[PDB]
């Protein structure tokens, strides 16, 4: 079933009629994560490439 | 290493200077403060969860204002200037110029010089120098131990 969030903004001196709205939010994260870097050094047409 | 420029918010209730300094530049000053706000969750993520949060007192706000957020902690960075005795080292390798005076910060083993382009020559003269240190404090103690910044 559908479960919706609340922002507590609207219905504020306004006439609401349709209760058929669902509020869905996207959440953004930033992390410092350990990754493995790989360096191909093929001499043909440029060598250093990580 | 890079030098950056950053803004300061709430300057009037954040920045405090040494009373003695009277110039517009604030050049004749020995110490300074820089206060900024934080959240308890960030205070826990950094520093440590073991000690509770103790914040500085300014008692400036709440002046006909509706306060709702008990989740702000005031932390101040502290700037000092000190006169310290440091030993200078004079490398006189004739190749690519001879006269070259350097400080004890860089050591022949700390940086991989290995006398390739340097001769010890004279390294005993001691001179008093002006240096600047920074620290982070609160109303309880030292969050970060003082460390020197690269300037004057």
């Amino acid at each position: 079933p559908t479960s919706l969030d609340v922002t507590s903004m609207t219905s504020w001196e306004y006439n609401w009629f349709g209760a058929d709205v669902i509020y869905i939010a996207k959440y953004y994260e930033v992390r410092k994560e350990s990754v493995d870097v790989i360096s191909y050094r093929h001499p043909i047409t440029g060598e250093i490439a990580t | 290493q890079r030098i950056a420029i950053e803004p300061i918010y709430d300057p009037s209730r954040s920045v405090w200077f040494d009373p003695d300094a009277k110039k517009y530049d604030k050049s004749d000053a020995l110490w300074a403060f820089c206060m900024y706000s934080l959240s308890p969750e960030k205070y826990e993520a950094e520093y440590g969860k073991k000690p509770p949060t103790s914040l500085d007192v300014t008692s400036m706000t709440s002046w006909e204002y509706n306060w709702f957020g008990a989740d702000v902690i005031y932390i101040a960075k502290y700037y000092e200037v000190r006169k310290e005795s440091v030993d200078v080292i004079s490398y006189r390798h004739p190749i690519t110029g001879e006269i070259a005076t350097y400080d004890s910060d860089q050591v022949e083993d700390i940086e991989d010089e290995l006398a390739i382009a340097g001769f010890h020559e004279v390294a005993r003269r001691s001179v008093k120098r002006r240096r600047v240190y920074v620290s982070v404090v609160d109303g309880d103690g030292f969050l970060e131990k003082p460390r020197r910044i690269p300037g004057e």
Binding site: - | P52, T53, S54, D56, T61, N66, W67
Partner: protein, 414 residues
């Protein structure tokens, strides 16, 4: 007589040394919303050895593993509140700004007064006769000597004395024969050094005062107490009943009195050998915790802090030479009912101190004020409809006593 200057005349102020000297590290961020009203710390273990001449002895009577605890709790609220009529209050006065200054000082003063009361109620060691004041160098050196002779090393000790006692010691220092710097400092500034006889010495104007409490008669123990480690492994407190007292008096033994057991001596905790004070052995002493009266027949029951453990099934936890048994003679230090200001000496790890954070009340404006490293929550509201406003200041402390045998009271002796 109408125009009044905007500057308030200066007032009196005490000093704060106890809160700065006690350990505020172990109990910090421990009484949280999950732990509850109390927290517990562990206790060190001790072992005893056997003496046998054979090696294939795989079947014998081995040791035991018993673990103790030290419990730290919270205290009551320290609150100061005022109400006013805004017309008169704002006639010329700075709306609790001239109230703002002397309220945090009152809060911290009450905090440290209660802390000193707690320290002298829970301390165990005693030295010197209460009547004799501090006059010479031995009266200060004895604390360090005794505390080293007990065997404590982890930490660093302190001793706190009144303003007058420091002057007499400095006057004594003025008579030195060879130290030019010390003689000059004592003559000019009248300031004693930091390290005095091996112990850091601090001078504090604010130290609490106590009255000894009327007593009389040659007291003796009625019933043999139970001082096994199983009994006293959590609180280091024990209850004892005594006879030979007066008929019936109230307040026979007040909080903070020192009772001395004559025939039981101290032990060096590691070597488990008695203590010898140069010319006489040192007897065991204990501190009254709560006020105790006496009923008909001179039967006085009292709870004391500091236990003379002499367990016989776990010998590794003994702390006194012999067990207290019925018929032993006890004494009480001091005179009948005199009042005095004691001097303190203690290790770092004797009593802790902490503060509990206070959240903000909903829909009520508030702020946080910092004074001497302590946070005070200030709230404002408008209960009542008669031009009455209310502001309140709140703080919540927490106390813990780790080991009573690393602290107590000390006095001078003739």
């Amino acid at each position: 007589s109408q125009i009044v200057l905007k500057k308030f005349l200066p007032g009196f102020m005490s000093d704060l040394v106890l809160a700065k000297t006690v350990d505020r590290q172990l109990l910090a961020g421990e009484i949280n919303s999950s732990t509850g009203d109390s927290v517990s710390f562990k206790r060190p273990h001790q072992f005893s050895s056997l003496r046998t001449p054979t090696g294939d002895i795989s079947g014998q009577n081995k040791n035991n593993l018993i673990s103790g605890k030290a419990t730290g709790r919270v205290g009551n609220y320290i609150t100061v509140a005022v109400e006013y009529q805004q017309l008169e209050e704002a006639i010329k006065l700075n709306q609790l700004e001239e109230i703002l200054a002397p309220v945090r000082q009152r809060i911290v003063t009450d905090l440290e007064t209660e802390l000193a009361h707690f320290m002298m109620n829970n301390g165990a060691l005693s030295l010197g006769s209460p009547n004799t004041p501090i006059t010479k160098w031995s009266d200060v050196a004895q604390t360090a000597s005794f505390l080293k002779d007990l065997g404590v090393n982890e930490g660093e000790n302190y001793a706190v004395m009144d303003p007058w006692s420091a002057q007499r010691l400095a006057d004594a220092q003025t008579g030195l024969h060879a130290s030019d710097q010390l003689v000059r400092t004592a003559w000019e500034n009248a300031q004693i050094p930091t390290n005095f006889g091996g112990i850091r010495a601090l001078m504090s104007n604010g130290l609490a005062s106590r009255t000894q409490g009327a007593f009389g008669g040659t007291l003796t123990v009625k019933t043999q107490p139970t001082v096994t480690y199983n009994a006293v492994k959590d609180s280091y407190q024990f209850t004892v009943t005594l006879t030979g007292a007066t008929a019936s008096v109230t307040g026979f033994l007040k909080a903070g009195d020192q009772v001395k057991f004559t025939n039981t001596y101290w032990l060096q905790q590691q070597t488990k050998q008695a203590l010898y004070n140069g010319a006489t052995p040192i007897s065991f002493t204990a501190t009254v915790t709560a006020d105790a009266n006496s009923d008909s027949g001179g039967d006085v029951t009292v709870t004391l802090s500091g236990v003379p453990i002499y367990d016989t099934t776990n010998p590794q936890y003994n702390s006194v030479s012999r067990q207290v048994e019925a018929g032993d003679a006890v004494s009480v230090v001091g005179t009948a009912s005199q009042t005095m200001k004691p001097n303190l000496f203690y290790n770092k790890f004797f009593c802790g101190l902490g503060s509990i954070p206070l959240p903000k009340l909903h829909s009520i404006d508030s702020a946080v004020a910092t004074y001497e490293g302590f946070s005070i929550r200030v709230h404002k509201y408008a209960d009542g409809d008669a031009n009455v406003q209310k502001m309140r200041f709140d703080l919540l402390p927490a106390y813990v006593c780790f080991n009573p045998h690393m602290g107590g009271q000390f006095f001078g002796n003739p």
